């Protein structure tokens, strides 16, 4: 991630661009991913759980929006 | 190929042979032969200078062209034949002008292949060019230490030299031993590895096999008396000494190289 700051740009907005540009690239998330080895079985299992959660989340949300609570 | 002998008798159970059907079954090239006599480890004083040498089968030396100065004349490999004088085989080549010579057989060479020597030769195995014109990172064998002196490196059965760097007038070579050495770019080298890479897989199998090739038995220093060897004797099997050579020099670790002349060319030692 690269950000170029001019002479007239106040630091507050310039600083936030780093927090919004680098974080968008996922540097803080990618680095944590390679800190320790997730064994290939773990990768498939966690990805499988995420996929189930992603699909189940929409199913759960869609049904709830059509169901009254009070 | 490697063949394991069937255990039809002791001394034949453990014998492993290297059989090359491509080798010529007939007599060698007579005009390129000469007589070399066994010395038995004796120098001009008659004293045993090096031990464990003696006997063995009679051998006839064959002039092997280690220089390869025939430039611009293509040659064809007539045949591959056994060489008793070295681990590698020798390929008989015929220059189209009518001259025959012996060269070390590269890895993939076979009868009828095209080989050329010179500065403008193609980049193929068996071709000899100065390392100035040879691309870096290419495997070569039979490298000369000095221009025009003849190859002296990577001559064994499966040995080879890797050209790693080329800086100015010197080329740094990764020798088979693992040490890096500097040689002039004008020295010649032969592309490709040396043939008969299976020479290391053979097993002599029996004591007589070593004797056939002129290797006399080696006697341990422990079994010696104190007068003969520093390891000496002792009632029973006693050692109680730092291992040394029969002339008292410490062995098993002691560095021995003391050549201050050419340590400039040794960029890095083997280990």
């Amino acid at each position: 991630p690269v950000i170029k700051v001019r002479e007239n740009e106040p630091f507050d907005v310039a600083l936030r661009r780093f927090k919004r540009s680098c974080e968008k690239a996922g540097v803080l998330a990618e680095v944590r991913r390679r800190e320790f080895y997730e064994k290939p079985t773990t990768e498939r299992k966690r990805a499988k759980a995420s996929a189930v959660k992603r699909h189940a989340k929409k199913l759960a949300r869609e049904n709830a929006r059509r169901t009254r609570l009070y | 190929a490697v063949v394991k002998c069937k255990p039809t008798s002791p001394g034949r159970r453990h014998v492993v042979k290297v059989v090359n059907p491509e080798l010529h079954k007939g007599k060698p090239f007579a005009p390129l032969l000469e007589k070399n006599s066994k010395s038995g480890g004796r120098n001009n004083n008659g004293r045993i200078t090096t031990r464990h040498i003696g006997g063995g089968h009679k051998q006839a030396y064959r002039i092997v062209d280690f220089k390869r100065n025939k430039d611009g004349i293509p040659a064809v490999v007539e045949r591959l034949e056994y060489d008793p004088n070295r681990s590698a085989n020798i390929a008989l080549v015929l220059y189209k002008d009518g001259e025959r010579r012996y060269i070390l057989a590269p890895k993939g060479l076979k009868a009828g292949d095209q080989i050329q020597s010179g500065v403008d030769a193609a980049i193929k195995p068996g071709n000899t060019l100065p390392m100035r014109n040879i691309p870096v990172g290419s495997t070569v064998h039979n490298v000369e230490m000095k221009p025009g002196k003849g190859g002296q490196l990577a001559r064994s059965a499966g040995t080879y030299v890797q050209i790693v760097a080329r800086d100015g007038a010197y080329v740094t070579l990764r020798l088979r031993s693992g040490e890096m050495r500097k040689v002039e770019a004008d020295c010649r080298a032969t592309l490709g590895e040396v043939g008969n890479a299976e020479h290391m897989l053979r097993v002599l199998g029996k004591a007589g096999a070593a004797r056939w090739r002129g290797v006399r038995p080696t006697v341990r220093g422990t079994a010696m008396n104190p007068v003969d060897h520093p390891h000496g004797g002792g009632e029973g099997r006693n050692f109680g000494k730092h291992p040394v050579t029969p002339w008292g020099v410490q062995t098993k670790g002691k560095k021995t190289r003391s050549n201050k002349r050419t340590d400039k060319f040794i960029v890095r030692r083997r280990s």
Partner: protein
């Protein structure tokens, strides 16, 4: 002595310690300061505050060079990732560009095994 006007600041943010170093555009180190050596040990150095203090000590270590322009190089995660950079404002230092240089391998080397805590 050299009186360089433009410099380069390297932030080696890490989960344990934060190292702040100031170097010219050519990468020749001028001065450095670290959280561990700033009176913080153990859990103390790990906090973001230790990162900002280390930045302050870095400014004094290079005030004799009289540098004005700075390049903030940031590597690795840690609470000192953002605290240290903001500390340069307390010193009034001027910067020209900010970039992320955290190593991101394309697989390759074997990462160490997980810790069964």
């Amino acid at each position: 002595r050299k009186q360089v006007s433009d410099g380069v600041a390297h932030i080696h943010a890490s989960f344990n310690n934060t190292i702040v170093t100031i170097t010219d555009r050519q990468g020749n180190a001028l001065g450095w300061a670290t959280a561990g050596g700033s009176g913080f040990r153990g859990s103390r150095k790990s906090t973001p505050f230790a990162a900002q203090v280390a930045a302050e000590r870095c400014a004094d270590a290079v005030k004799e060079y009289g540098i004005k322009n700075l390049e903030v190089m940031v590597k690795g995660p840690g609470p000192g990732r953002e605290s240290t950079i903001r500390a340069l404002n307390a010193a009034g230092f001027r910067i020209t560009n900010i970039t992320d240089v955290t190593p991101i391998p394309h697989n390759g080397c074997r990462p160490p095994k997980k810790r069964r805590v």
